[PDB]
Structure formats: C-alpha cells, structure tokens
Design a protein around this ligand. Sequence first.
Ligand SMILES: COCc1cccc(S(=O)(=O)N(CC(C)C)[C@@H](C(=O)NO)C(C)C)c1
Ligand SMILES: [Zn+2]
Length: 500
Amino acid sequence: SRYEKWEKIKQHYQHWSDSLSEEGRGLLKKLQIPIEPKKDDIIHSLSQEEKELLKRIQIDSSSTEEKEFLKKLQIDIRDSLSEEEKELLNPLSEKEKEFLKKLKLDIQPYDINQRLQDTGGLIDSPSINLDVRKQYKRDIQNIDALLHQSIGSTLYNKIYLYENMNINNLTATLGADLVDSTDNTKINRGIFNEFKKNFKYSISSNYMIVDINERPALDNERLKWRIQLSPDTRAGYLENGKLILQRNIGLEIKDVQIIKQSEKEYIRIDAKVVPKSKIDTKIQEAQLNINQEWNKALGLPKYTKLITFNVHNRYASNIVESAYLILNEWKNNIQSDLIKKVTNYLVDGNGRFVFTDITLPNIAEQYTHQDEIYEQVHSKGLYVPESRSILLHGPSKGVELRNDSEGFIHEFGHAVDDYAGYLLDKNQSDLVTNSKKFIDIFKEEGSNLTSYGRTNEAEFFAEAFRLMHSTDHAERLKVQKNAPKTFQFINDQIKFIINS
Ligand SMILES: COCc1cccc(S(=O)(=O)N(CC(C)C)[C@@H](C(=O)NO)C(C)C)c1
Ligand SMILES: [Zn+2]
C-alpha cells in the first residue's frame, strides 16, 4: 500500500523530524527551493546604456535558463514601450559579450544541489565568488550533519524509492532523439539499446530528492528511476511523501527497460545504492586501462597520464564509454603521424584529454589558468593552450555539431593550430592562426564554412579542420571548394608538422 508505506517511513524518521531546529528546516527548504535572483535588483543595478544594450541584444548568440532568465530579464525591461516596438524587436558585439561575461556572475541563483552537481562535490573550485563559495560549504556541511539517520536494516529491502527525470539532464545529445519523431508516445528502440548498453553505474554527488510513492510523469519526464537503498544509506523525511538522500552515493544499474504507463512509453531505470568508492574504483580502473591502450598505440611511455576521467554525476559510466568511442573515431579519421606528433607535444606540456560530467569552469585544466570567473567558459568542449588540454563535457548539448566525436576532432584542430605556430617559432610560441597570412585568409573565406566558424580565426581553423576530416565525403569537398585557401593552408601545416 502506498499510504501505508508512506506512514511507515515517516514514523521511522518521526523523532528525527521533530528534533529539527528552525535553522535545520529552513536549510532543508532552501535546498529544495533554490533562491532565485531578484530581477528587479539586477535591472536597477545597470546603467541605462546597459539597459538599452540588454534591451535589444540577441541573447542566444553566446545555460538555456540563463538565456531564459536574461530574456525574462529583457522582457521585464521591455514592458514599458510600444507594442509595435516589441513586435519589431522580436555573433555578438565584443562590447556585448564582454558585458554578458560580467553579467553572468550576478544572475546565479543560490542552488546547493546545482553547486554540487556542477562541481561534482569539489566545492572549493574557484568558479564562484569566494564568500558565496564559503556559504555553500557551510550549508552543505550542515546538511551532512542533519542527514545522520540511516534507512535501517529493516526497511531497506522492503521499499522502493522513485525519481522522475528529464533525459537531457543525463545527456542532451541523446535526449534530442530518444523520443520517436513520428510518435512522441514511443521510445526509439535504436537509441535505447545503446543507452542501455553503456549504463552500468551512476553517481550522485548532490542530495537526491526521491518520492516514496511513484509520481506520474510530467511533460519531459520520460525517465522513471526505481531505487533500492542500502541498509546504512543516510536519509531524511520531507513533507508530502519524499526522502532526501545523503550526497556522494553510488548506484549500480540493475535493469533498464521500456515500460508502458497510460499508453505512453517511458524508460524505467532500476538501480541499487552501493558505496561510491566501489564505483570510483571501476572508473579509476577504466582510466588506467584506456591510458595503457593509448600509450602503446601512440608510442608513449607506459605510465603516461594523458586521458582523465573527471566523472562525478548520474550518467557516469557513459562518459567513460564515450571516451573510448570518441578516441577511436579520432584515430580513424586523422593520420597517425599527425596524431602522434601533436599528442607528444601536448604531453610535453603535461596536457590531458579530460572527459567529464562536471562543468568546465570547475576543471583544473582551465581554472588554474583562468582566475577571472568572467573569463571562465562552460561549453561542450574546449582547448586550453596554457595547459595543452582538451576538455569535453558529456552532458551538455553542443552548437551545430552532431556527436561528440566531431567535437573532439574540432578541439584537436585547436591543438594542431597551437603546434603549427610553435614549430614556426619555438621561442614566441603563438597560434598559427595569429599569423598574418591566415588572418587575411580568414578575412576572405571566413564566412564560407559553418556559422560558428565565423567567430574568429582560431574557430574558423578548427571548424575547417573538422570538416576536412569528416566521414562524410561531401563535407570534405565543401571545404576544398568553398574555402580553397583555408583548405590548402591546413594541409600545409599538416605536412609541416609531420615532417618535423
Ligand atoms: C555534441 O558536441 C558538440 C560540441 C563538441 C565540442 C565543443 C562544442 S562547443 O562548445 O559548442 N564549441 C563550438 C563547437 C562548434 C566546436 C566550443 C569550441 O569552439 N571549442 O573549441 C565553443 C562554444 C567554445 C560542441
Ligand atoms: Zn573551438
């Protein structure tokens, strides 16, 4: 019985609940309901030239919510003028982006669970204001102290706990086409099998909030987790039949099936709570294995640390399994000599291929070279010349690209750009796209390739490189055709690098 099971759990935690102080309850409430920014106070703090700038700016050219909040911000600023003006109003200026980069630090909500997920538990990551960073730390530590009572040896194997979830949260890449296009009540059997094949374990770095009784799905809640706790899993009762689980727990995926609820298809994920260290072990074992493979394959020292698994979140095992596929497509589409030469260069600078489910501003390969948070970047992928590293963020959705394999190759094009400029002058060590020859090439052919390739010389080069190494024959030819100077320039650098 649903209501019986509910009361039985509430009872188990009744003394715990009644013992909560005023600050303890408010802390638990603040966690469930994050404190949103005050858009009135934000707008008030802007100069009226910045308001006009924020009024007419196309904000999506830069999170979706950040753009949605800014659009919520813009709409609130725009609701004082004409109807005709608003209907009319419906890359960036370097004045515009430079403005948004500083505005991003003022619109961040105080969200404990989000701070944990983004950092993967590494809350000392210098990606937010120090004072706020210390505030999260106090709350998190205090919540840890609150969640001290375990589920117990009696209840752990007599109950199931449930969690409805949006697919895009795990990976927005597969979430785009896991629902059948022809029939949205159906799940694409193809993607499901791959999804199921690579999900063997999961990690929760924040506080999971689960339902005692299964709640009917909302709009984009196509994932329905069924969780069995372990006897010493620490938790707390929340009002309206919910449990808050301790942070830093591991989940073994026991079964992934397609089920039917109300003539619509959902994915059920059965998972059992295990020690997080047990899963961290499997991750570290996988990290050492993939490095052993690629050290031999690349002609590198046996113990070279090149590939990093910075994995802390709910779709952990796929981040691991995707890195294998990504590097394989990378190996297949790029000359082995171009690869070895450039990779050895990265290793000289103690570089890494970082595959992670935490946000890039919280990746040490970035923030140790980027002190200003307004210069810190989150995106699907990145190349950081200061650390000679490629960073790839699994969960997020990427701009204009299909899979992550194309994303990595694009990032590798950045390393090629780097290495080309180094060989050109080993004392200056600048990017070859900063050379005047390529600059003029960009001024001409810079608008022929992909939309994002129009951003700058470095980006144009990377996009060009990616398309020149695509599996699609047509897109290789488009570069050779629409950007012949760029096409030849890269082949020049590739020849240059190999013959070193
Ligand atoms: C499905 O994955 C797609 C994907 C893979 C890798 C990176 C990204 S990206 O973040 O959108 N991205 C631009 C794209 C076109 C490479 C970043 C970038 O120029 N890196 O060097 C750019 C925003 C800084 C997306
Ligand atoms: Zn790029």
